[PDB]
Amino acid sequence: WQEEVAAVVVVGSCMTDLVSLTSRLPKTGETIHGHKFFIGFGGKGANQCVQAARLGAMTSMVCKVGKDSFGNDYIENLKQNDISTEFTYQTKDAATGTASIIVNNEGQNIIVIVAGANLLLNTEDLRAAANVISRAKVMVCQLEITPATSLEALTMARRSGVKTLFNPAPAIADLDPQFYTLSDVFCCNESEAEILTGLTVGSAADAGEAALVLLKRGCQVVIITLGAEGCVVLSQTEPEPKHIPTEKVKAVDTTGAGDSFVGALAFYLAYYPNLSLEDMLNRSNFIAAVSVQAAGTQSSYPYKKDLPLTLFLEHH
């Protein structure tokens, strides 16, 4: 008997985060000593997948890691979060992707990303995932893997009528035009928006303007997250920007909040399709805001059993 399908498929990155906490950031040629080191699980794709899974989504992570200790440990992390690893591949040709992060006591950081194995996730690897993709409700992609691969995944999703949620992160100024036209929901932050559009974006009104450019490039729904100001949304049917504020909380660590938001949104798009988009975004704001109230990235992302029941009910 054919079992429950994954409703949320994430094609994207897994990165081992190698974090050192220090009291100052080093300069060229310097050695410095920090006071704490830890390994965390990151990568935009996996962050998003994990948030959606913890909310109860059945998910499948399509990604490539290394045939190495960090890749075996990432696979176990996915499984622990009840994520299908059927299309989590391993390769000996490159190490699992890494992010080396140095963070001083003011939260300023230096980051060196080596994408590694993530970049060897190829179009044949996606084709083997075709039946899972075609049965999904939502496909989520970012800009951490090879762009040809992500383009293919969005293409495959469209061909089966699967909703596409694209997060253009990290952003680049000459993004292939297809990424706008293949996105049903296009979601980025202020700094990404500024890179994509060339406009200065430092307010919800500014984000409104930038969103309109992204819409005219061929997006259907455009969401710009705004940190503690919440998010702003527009769409082809309602092109007037709608600012969706979020209640004032005292942040502990905002790292990974955007991924929390996107994963929440993927969950809602997949399991609650009749909610209004404004409702989905209020809920996604809420969930991301819970994540900013805890340290870490993925270890901050809330589970369904710790969130209020009202986040899982149909509209009042």
Ligand X SMILES: Nc1ncnc2c1ncn2[C@@H]1O[C@H](COP(=O)(O)OP(=O)(O)CP(=O)(O)O)[C@@H](O)[C@H]1O
Q: Per CB under 5 A, which region of 93-101, 153-161, 197-205, 302-310 contacts Cl ion?
A: 153-161
CA dist 3 and 131 (Å) reads 13
Min separation Cβ 254 and a copy of itself, Å? 13
Query: Would you say 296 is a known binding-site residue?
Result: yes
Q: Per CB under 5 A, which region of 35-43, 55-63, 281-289, 294-302 contacts Cl ion?
A: 35-43
| C-alpha distance from residue 18 to each of 74, 160, 169, 218 (Å) | 13, 38, 20, 38
Query: Would you say 167 is a known binding-site residue?
Result: no
Per the annotation, the verdict on 259 as an active-site residue is yes
R_g (Cα) of the chain, nearest Å:
19
**Residue owning tokens 């092109």:** 239
Catalytic residue selected from 82, 259, 279, 306: 259
Q: Please check whether residue 266 is in contact with residue 292, taking contact to mean a CB–CB distance below 8 angstroms.
A: no
258 binds Na ion (CB under 5 A): yes
Query: Pick from Na ion, Cl ion, a copy of itself, none: which does 23 bind, CB < 5 to 8 A by kind?
Result: Cl ion
Tokens representing 238 are 């309602």
Min separation Cβ 222 and ligand X, Å? 14
Tokens representing 107 are 């939260």
Query: Pick from ligand X, Cl ion, Na ion, none: which does 35 bind, CB < 5 to 8 A by kind?
Result: Cl ion
Footprint (CB under 6 A) of ligand X, residues 273-312? 285, 288-289, 292
Q: Please check whether residue 156 is in contact with residue 164, taking contact to mean a CB–CB distance below 8 angstroms.
A: no
CA dist 156 and 311 (Å) reads 31
Nearest to 60 by CA among 32, 31, 87: 87
257 binds ligand X (CB under 6 A): yes
Query: Would you say 16 is a known binding-site residue?
Result: yes
Interface contacts to ligand X, rule CB under 6 A: 189, 225-228, 230-231, 246, 249, 251, 254, 256-258, 261, 285, 288-289, 292
